[PDB]
């Protein structure tokens, strides 16, 4: 065996080659045919299959990944020289294993795991251009043009310092383009923040795609990266050979996995309680228990959590539909709006919290910045591409920001003309905006536009405008206080799993009952407004709400009850916003 290891080249190759041919879910030889037909010589492998097939080889694999992988390549190439012995390929088959060790708490990583293959889930934050890394430097004498090359002198390139033909002093200068190069794109990735237990100090690591798997993942992608953990010294000065006793560590990526749920008991349990007739009311009341005397608002945000079913309108040429729900909660200061956003943001997965001010630390926009790599820093909206962005003080925002919010609400994407090029960053978020009335309190008889002073277009894009006020009712003050002092002296986990499963599995589809009910609702609203009348945007909101309400019941189809309650809440939002 190679020194300091338990690794036999032939036996490991034979065992791996045996695993390729002999497997129980044989799929490896089938995708070998796909690679032979397609010609893409990279054969990615789930390492857990090797664990199931042979844990010792899997253990042996992880211990010495750099050494075992060439054996794996030799196994597959000879298999390709066995299966499809004749073919044409620009390079022979490679392998990109993945999904081996879910020690994904990058905050919990140790020097014990140096040069051991690992996979971790995280969100790529910053990227770069593929670094042209020199690997063989052609050289030419200034005196006699002596042609020579130096090949892979251990990262650095050894200067000749003396010619070979005329043998003069140092005259052989490198020729850049004649030199050989490879691609090494550097990538900076943040540890998956939801996965972290505390999150008090989110972790970031550098990654490198060397000559392969380059540029395939753009910033903001929450993916599982699999590669070899690696550490290197750093010279105290470039000129001197002294180095620090501490090594900065990075990853040489091998595979990117773009990214069942729970066990049978949870799906059984959530399906059991879904059958409760008042699950919609219980879940609404159960949502945010610290709140008191708010049910319409709780139901609306609850429908926003479930959201409408994803709809692919590519065939229609109509563009992407805003399947997500955006609700603006407008109410007096001290009315629990901030607590509602914090509770939802804390509860919700892959969500974000920001404030309308530009002083918000996260920032609701993405823009370039130089280290001096002019690299793009993302935004909370782009970060919450599928999550929920809880925006506080939405009334106090800049017009440039308001234009951005109109765009993403109109498109669920953000267009940024970085440098000169333009990029459309998808943001399919659910926007939980919170605004407060201008002046000390909300002046009655003044419209939301008057008392918040925002464009009619942008506020109209919000499917729901929930108006809440603190009434001047001492009984309400008395009951609220008793509720608080009662609190002075269902768990969120089950509700979170319910919503996640409903997102994952249940995708409500329309019923003609829902179709006719919605059409009846809109024309009734049109007739009421015939004498701020009805608009087809209101129909779209009613469409989305019924999808969410159907998703709440896990019916997997939109029913008339979804339409009826959606119209009820839509009228409640109208009643809350009614002014005439």
């Amino acid at each position: 065996v190679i020194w300091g290891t338990d690794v036999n080249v032939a036996a490991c190759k034979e065992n791996f080659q045996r695993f390729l041919q002999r497997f129980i879910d044989p799929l490896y030889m089938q995708r070998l045919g796909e690679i032979n037909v397609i010609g893409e010589p990279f054969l990615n492998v789930n390492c857990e299959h090797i664990k199931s097939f042979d844990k010792n080889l899997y253990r042996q694999l992880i211990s010495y990944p750099q050494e075992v992988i060439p054996t794996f390549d030799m196994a597959v190439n000879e298999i390709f020289f066995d299966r499809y012995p004749d073919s044409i390929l620009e390079h022979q088959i490679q392998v990109r294993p993945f999904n081996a060790l879910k020690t994904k708490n990058m905050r919990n990583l140790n020097p014990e795991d140096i040069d051991q293959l690992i996979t971790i889930s995280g969100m790529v934050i910053r990227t770069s251009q593929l670094i042209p890394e020199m690997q063989e430097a052609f050289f030419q004498c200034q005196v006699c043009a002596h042609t020579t090359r130096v090949e892979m002198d251990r990262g650095r390139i050894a200067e000749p310092s003396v010619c070979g033909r005329c043998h003069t002093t140092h005259s052989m200068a490198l020729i850049h383009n004649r030199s050989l190069f490879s691609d090494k794109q550097m990538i900076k990735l943040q540890e998956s923040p939801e996965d972290m237990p505390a999150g008090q100090t989110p972790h970031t690591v550098i990654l490198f795609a060397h000559n392969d798997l380059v540029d395939k993942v753009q910033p903001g992608d929450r993916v599982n990266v699999t590669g070899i953990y690696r550490a290197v010294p750093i010279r105290v000065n470039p000129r001197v050979s002294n180095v620090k006793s501490v090594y900065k560590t990075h990853i040489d990526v091998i595979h990117y996995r773009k990214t069942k749920l729970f066990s049978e008991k949870r799906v059984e349990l959530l399906k059991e309680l879904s059958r409760k007739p008042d699950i919609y009311e219980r879940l609404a009341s159960a949502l945010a228990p610290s709140i008191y005397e708010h049910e319409d608002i709780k139901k609306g945000i609850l429908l926003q959590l479930f959201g409408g079913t994803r709809k692919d309108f590519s065939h229609t040429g109509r563009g992407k539909f805003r399947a997500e729900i955006n609700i603006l909660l407008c109410g007096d200061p001290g009315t629990s709006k901030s607590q509602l956003l914090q509770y939802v943001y804390n509860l919700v997965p892959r969500g974000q919290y920001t404030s309308g001010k530009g002083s918000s630390a996260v920032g609701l926009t993405a823009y370039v910045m130089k280290d001096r790599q002019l690299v793009l820093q993302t935004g909370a909206l782009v970060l919450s591409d599928n999550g929920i962005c809880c925006i506080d003080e939405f009334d106090k925002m800049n017009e440039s920001t308001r234009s951005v919010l109109h765009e993403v609400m109109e498109q669920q994407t953000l267009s940024i003309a970085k440098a000169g090029i333009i990029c459309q960053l998808n943001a399919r978020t659910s926007v939980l905006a919170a605004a407060n009335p201008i002046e000390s309190q909300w002046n009655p008889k003044k419209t939301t536009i008057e008392n918040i002073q925002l464009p009619h277009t942008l506020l109209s894009r919000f499917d729901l405008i929930f108006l809440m006020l603190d009434p001047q009712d001492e009984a309400y003050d008395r009951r609220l206080a008793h509720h608080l002092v009662a609190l002075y002296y269902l768990d969120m986990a089950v509700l979170k799993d319910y919503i996640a499963y409903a997102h994952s599995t249940i995708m409500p589809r329309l019923s003609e009952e829902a179709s006719q009910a919605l059409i009846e609702a809109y024309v009734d609203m049109r007739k009421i407004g015939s004498s701020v009348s009805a608009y087809p945007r209101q129909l779209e909101s009613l469409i989305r709400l019924a999808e969410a309400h159907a998703k709440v019941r896990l019916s997997n189809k939109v029913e008339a009850i979804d339409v009826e309650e959606a119209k009820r809440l839509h009228r409640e939002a109208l009643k809350q916003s009614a002014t005439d």
Partner: protein, 373 residues
């Protein structure tokens, strides 16, 4: 803080944690370390070399009968209040309020036991001097003017004075002139008792539990009652509501009371001591011992008190509706009143909040509102 004498300042010691000992501490942790003190060489009459402490073990740490008789005195807390900056003539009700902040709340279960107090008023009203006495009296404290928040130095997390409070008190003079970014930061502190900072877009969150004692002045000279609150001061009115109490000081020329203060000053000049009060001020160590005893207590709120508490709350909320200007009454106001009452119960060394404690807290709340006159 206790180690440093008043005339001195804290001194740092680099410590090298290694192996299993790592990850066992965070900034602001009041830890105790055991290890070897050794030199590191990163030549006059011998070599000069920086020192450090190689870490071995790390641990994150947390009277007489006559004293009890003094505690049993009904004017005990009043005597303690008089002992808070006795040279500062007047403002005794404020001095009581400062005492409540020093003891803080209970944090029963949780509840935000911190008592953030903001002070506004014309320059030259003992405001700055009051904070200094509190910092001296405080067992653990930080003083700042407006760094305040954490940072990622270049590659290390360096905690600001807000973090270094850590359930102490972060006295903040010149509060009105704070950077608006810091205003947002302290908003999070009063909201969640945490500080989120992102130098490299990495929202690192630090447990900044502490009570914030703010001090500001109205712009353009002295306060103008004809000009509304926040008309003379350039702070978000919402942030003012976040404070548990907000006391206003106005330079009303009152020839008699001003003369009384002048008499107080002249005595201090002629004696280097305040005039002999009814109860003499006590040594700060004795005060801190009483505070430490008060932190031992966590008085509860019986549900019978809730009926009267809610009765008082709706009454003052009605007064707010009667007031032409909204007086910031809300559930925030109720919760603060709960903090004050249980804080008073800690001063009483009684594990049940009394109606007396509730009433006095309302009195201070009313006076703070009356200060807005």
């Amino acid at each position: 803080s206790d180690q440093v004498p008043v005339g001195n300042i804290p001194r740092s010691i680099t410590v090298l944690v290694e192996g299993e000992n790592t990850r066992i501490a965070q900034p602001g942790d009041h830890v105790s370390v055991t290890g070897i003190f050794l030199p590191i060489l990163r030549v006059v009459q011998g070599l000069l070399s920086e020192t450090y402490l190689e870490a071995h073990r790390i641990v994150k740490m947390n009277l007489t009968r006559e004293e009890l008789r003094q505690i049993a005195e009904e004017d005990f807390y009043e005597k303690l209040a008089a002992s808070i900056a006795p040279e500062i003539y007047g403002h005794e009700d404020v001095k009581k309020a400062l005492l409540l902040l020093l003891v803080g709340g209970v944090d029963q279960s949780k509840i935000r036991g911190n008592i953030n107090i903001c002070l506004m008023g014309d320059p030259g009203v003992a405001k700055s001097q009051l904070l200094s006495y509190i910092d001296r009296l405080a067992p653990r404290s930080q003083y700042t003017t407006g760094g305040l928040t954490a940072a990622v130095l270049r590659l290390t997390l360096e905690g600001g004075a807000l973090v270094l409070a850590d359930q102490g008190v972060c006295c903040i003079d010149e509060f009105d002139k704070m950077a608006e970014a810091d205003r947002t930061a302290i908003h999070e502190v009063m909201e969640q008792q945490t500080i989120s900072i992102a130098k490299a877009g990495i929202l690192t969150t630090l447990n900044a539990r502490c009570s914030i004692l703010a001090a500001a002045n109205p712009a353009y000279g002295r306060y103008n009652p004809r000009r509304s609150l926040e008309q003379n001061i350039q702070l978000p009115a919402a942030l003012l509501s976040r404070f548990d109490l907000l006391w206003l000081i106005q330079d009303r020329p009152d020839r008699d009371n001003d003369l009384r203060l002048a008499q107080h000053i002249t005595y201090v000049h002629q004696h280097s001591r305040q005039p002999p009060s009814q109860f003499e001020p006590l040594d700060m160590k004795l005060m801190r011992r009483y505070i430490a005893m008060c932190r031992e207590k966590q008085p509860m709120v019986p549900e019978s008190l809730a009926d009267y508490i809610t009765a008082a709350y709706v009454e003052m909320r009605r007064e707010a509706w009667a007031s032409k200007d909204a007086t910031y009454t809300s559930a925030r106001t109720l919760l603060a009143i709960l903090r004050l009452s249980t804080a008073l119960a800690r001063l009483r060394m009684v594990d049940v909040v009394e109606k007396e404690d509730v009433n006095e807290a309302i009195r201070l709340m009313e006076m703070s509102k009356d200060s807005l006159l």
